[PDB]
Design an enzyme around this catalytic site. Structure first.
Site, PDB file in Angstrom:
ATOM      1  N   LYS A  49       7.101  -1.361   6.703  1.00 42.58           N
ATOM      2  CA  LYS A  49       6.559  -0.065   6.664  1.00 42.58           C
ATOM      3  C   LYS A  49       7.652   1.132   6.570  1.00 42.58           C
ATOM      4  CE  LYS A  49       2.989   2.894   9.078  1.00 42.58           C
ATOM      5  NZ  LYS A  49       2.292   2.984  10.222  1.00 42.58           N
ATOM      6  N   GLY A  52       2.635   6.640   3.750  1.00 37.56           N
ATOM      7  CA  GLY A  52       4.035   6.307   3.340  1.00 37.56           C
ATOM      8  C   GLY A  52       3.792   5.081   2.564  1.00 37.56           C
ATOM      9  N   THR A  53       4.858   4.181   2.408  1.00 38.73           N
ATOM     10  CA  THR A  53       4.581   3.054   1.780  1.00 38.73           C
ATOM     11  C   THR A  53       5.015   1.657   2.417  1.00 38.73           C
ATOM     12  OG1 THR A  53       5.721   4.268   0.091  1.00 38.73           O
ATOM     13  CG2 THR A  53       5.541   2.037  -0.521  1.00 38.73           C
ATOM     14  N   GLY A  93       0.685  -1.181   0.098  1.00 35.36           N
ATOM     15  CA  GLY A  93      -0.120   0.107  -0.074  1.00 35.36           C
ATOM     16  C   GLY A  93       0.785   1.229  -0.076  1.00 35.36           C
ATOM     17  N   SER A  94       0.175   2.494  -0.526  1.00 30.68           N
ATOM     18  CA  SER A  94       0.987   3.511  -0.349  1.00 30.68           C
ATOM     19  C   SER A  94       0.074   4.907  -0.090  1.00 30.68           C
ATOM     20  CB  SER A  94       1.678   3.874  -1.768  1.00 30.68           C
ATOM     21  OG  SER A  94       1.069   3.184  -2.808  1.00 30.68           O
ATOM     22  N   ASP A 147      -8.141   3.844  18.403  1.00 35.64           N
ATOM     23  CA  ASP A 147      -8.505   3.729  17.061  1.00 35.64           C
ATOM     24  C   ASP A 147      -8.732   2.353  16.358  1.00 35.64           C
ATOM     25  OD1 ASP A 147      -8.728   4.662  14.352  1.00 35.64           O
ATOM     26  OD2 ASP A 147      -6.633   4.776  13.736  1.00 35.64           O
TER      27      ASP A 147
HETATM   28  C1  LIG Z   1      -7.330  -2.227   4.940  1.00 35.47           C
HETATM   29  C2  LIG Z   1      -6.205  -2.241   4.292  1.00 35.47           C
HETATM   30  C3  LIG Z   1      -5.101  -3.363   4.038  1.00 35.47           C
HETATM   31  O1  LIG Z   1      -5.062  -3.915   5.266  1.00 35.47           O
HETATM   32  N1  LIG Z   1      -4.525  -3.949   3.014  1.00 35.47           N
HETATM   33  C4  LIG Z   1      -3.624  -5.138   2.989  1.00 35.47           C
HETATM   34  C5  LIG Z   1      -2.758  -5.653   4.036  1.00 35.47           C
HETATM   35  C6  LIG Z   1      -2.216  -6.782   3.935  1.00 35.47           C
HETATM   36  N2  LIG Z   1      -1.515  -7.257   5.012  1.00 35.47           N
HETATM   37  C7  LIG Z   1      -0.394  -6.487   5.952  1.00 35.47           C
HETATM   38  N3  LIG Z   1       0.254  -7.007   6.788  1.00 35.47           N
HETATM   39  C8  LIG Z   1       0.868  -6.267   7.685  1.00 35.47           C
HETATM   40  C9  LIG Z   1       0.742  -5.119   7.761  1.00 35.47           C
HETATM   41  C10 LIG Z   1       0.018  -4.522   6.815  1.00 35.47           C
HETATM   42  C11 LIG Z   1      -0.305  -3.109   6.801  1.00 35.47           C
HETATM   43  C12 LIG Z   1       0.090  -2.294   7.948  1.00 35.47           C
HETATM   44  N4  LIG Z   1      -0.039  -0.790   7.701  1.00 35.47           N
HETATM   45  C13 LIG Z   1      -0.801  -1.047   6.374  1.00 35.47           C
HETATM   46  C14 LIG Z   1      -1.189   0.003   5.527  1.00 35.47           C
HETATM   47  C15 LIG Z   1      -1.380   1.583   6.031  1.00 35.47           C
HETATM   48  C16 LIG Z   1      -1.803  -0.323   4.341  1.00 35.47           C
HETATM   49  C17 LIG Z   1      -1.690  -1.648   3.834  1.00 35.47           C
HETATM   50  C18 LIG Z   1      -1.245  -2.613   4.640  1.00 35.47           C
HETATM   51  N5  LIG Z   1      -0.806  -2.205   6.120  1.00 35.47           N
HETATM   52  N6  LIG Z   1      -0.751  -5.085   5.917  1.00 35.47           N
HETATM   53  C19 LIG Z   1      -2.100  -7.308   2.665  1.00 35.47           C
HETATM   54  O2  LIG Z   1      -1.204  -8.656   2.455  1.00 35.47           O
HETATM   55  C20 LIG Z   1      -1.609  -9.273   1.563  1.00 35.47           C
HETATM   56  C21 LIG Z   1      -2.641  -6.953   1.707  1.00 35.47           C
HETATM   57  C22 LIG Z   1      -3.498  -5.687   1.795  1.00 35.47           C
HETATM   58  N7  LIG Z   1      -4.085  -5.361   0.539  1.00 35.47           N
HETATM   59  C23 LIG Z   1      -3.266  -4.748  -0.427  1.00 35.47           C
HETATM   60  C24 LIG Z   1      -5.403  -5.752   0.361  1.00 35.47           C
HETATM   61  C25 LIG Z   1      -6.255  -4.363   0.031  1.00 35.47           C
HETATM   62  N8  LIG Z   1      -6.354  -3.932  -1.563  1.00 35.47           N
HETATM   63  C26 LIG Z   1      -7.402  -4.636  -1.772  1.00 35.47           C
HETATM   64  C27 LIG Z   1      -6.092  -2.634  -1.823  1.00 35.47           C
END
Ligand SMILES: *CCC(=O)Nc1cc(Nc2nccc(-c3cnc4c(C)cccn34)n2)c(OC)cc1N(C)CCN(C)C
Length: 268
Positions: free
Chosen positions: A41, A20-21, A18-19, A125
């Protein structure tokens, strides 16, 4: 009590979602033949170190585990990879396949994680976007950027909007909104209503509507999370008990039509 948690510093040589990044990757500690799926992150650095402080101090099966930080140009958070994403996008993407067993079990696990009260920690949150899915049978609470009596208006208690007061019982309010998100399969709370008018609506006595799949038993629990008197709201330990009973007979409480890689949890 002294916080004897260990902050692990990881070499950059040992490593897009996702995208900080936030990036997806593998952590390979030198020597040990293990590959760990991870997520990678002055104001920005100060707040991510506060977040790293909180995550290093918690250890619970329903709370996201911190693996360490990497000190480069910007400080990087290295946490466990949750392959199924956040629970908000999961229920939206898989509406036509979520059964009542999974919904009630998620409510149990989220209440178990909200352990945070034992740690005397207020999340501030809690939301469906901040619950990650390791497997469909195992979810964990994440996003401690606001963790700390001691902002997303539509998830906050009335006392938090009016007086900026946050307690464990204000987290219970956010828990109620989070359950509402799951039972509506990802609907936006107060969709259309601007945030500035949420304070006036909650004061008049209005609440989120009863989701179609929810028996009065389940909706009554959400309503109790949205009481003006914070001490009249249920405790997380009680929400564990209630949702556990309902999880033993899910169709009685939710009416739904048609109802060397090593994971971080094993690298102790
Ligand atoms: C609600 C969004 C999301 O959680 N997407 C996502 C998360 C995945 N796993 C994962 N594992 C550890 C940490 C994160 C994480 C922590 N902080 C963030 C942000 C700010 C954005 C995204 C993820 N973060 N996430 C994951 O692993 C496969 C995939 C996704 N997606 C990309 C699915 C969402 N997509 C449909 C846009």
């Amino acid at each position: 009590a002294p916080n004897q948690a260990l902050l692990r510093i990881l070499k950059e040589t040992e490593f897009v979602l996702g995208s900080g990044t936030v990036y997806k990757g593998l952590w390979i500690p030198e020597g040990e033949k293990v590959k760990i799926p991870v997520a990678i992150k002055p104001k920005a650095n100060k707040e991510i170190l506060d977040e790293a402080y909180v995550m290093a101090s918690v250890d619970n099966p329903h709370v996201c585990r911190l693996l360490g930080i990497c000190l480069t140009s910007t400080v990087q958070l290295i946490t466990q990879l949750m392959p199924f994403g956040c629970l908000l996008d999961y229920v939206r993407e898989h509406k036509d396949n979520i059964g009542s067993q999974y919904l009630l079990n998620w409510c149990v696990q989220i209440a178990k994680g909200m352990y945070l009260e034992d740690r005397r920690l207020v999340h501030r949150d809690l939301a469906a976007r901040n619950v990650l899915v390791k497997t469909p049978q195992h979810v964990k609470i994440t996003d401690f950027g606001l963790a700390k009596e001691y902002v997303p208006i539509k998830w906050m208690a009335l006392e938090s909007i009016l007086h900026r007061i946050y307690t464990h019982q204000s987290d219970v309010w956010s828990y109620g909104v989070t359950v509402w998100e799951l039972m509506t399969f990802g609907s936006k709370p107060y969709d259309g209503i601007p945030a500035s008018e949420i304070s006036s609506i909650l004061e008049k006595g209005e609440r989120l509507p009863q989701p179609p799949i929810c028996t009065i038993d389940v909706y009554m629990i959400m309503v109790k999370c949205w009481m003006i008197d914070a001490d009249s709201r249920p405790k997380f330990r009680e929400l564990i008990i209630e949702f556990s009973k309902m999880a033993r007979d899910p169709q009685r409480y939710l009416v739904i039509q048609g109802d060397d890689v090593v994971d971080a949890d094993e690298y102790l």
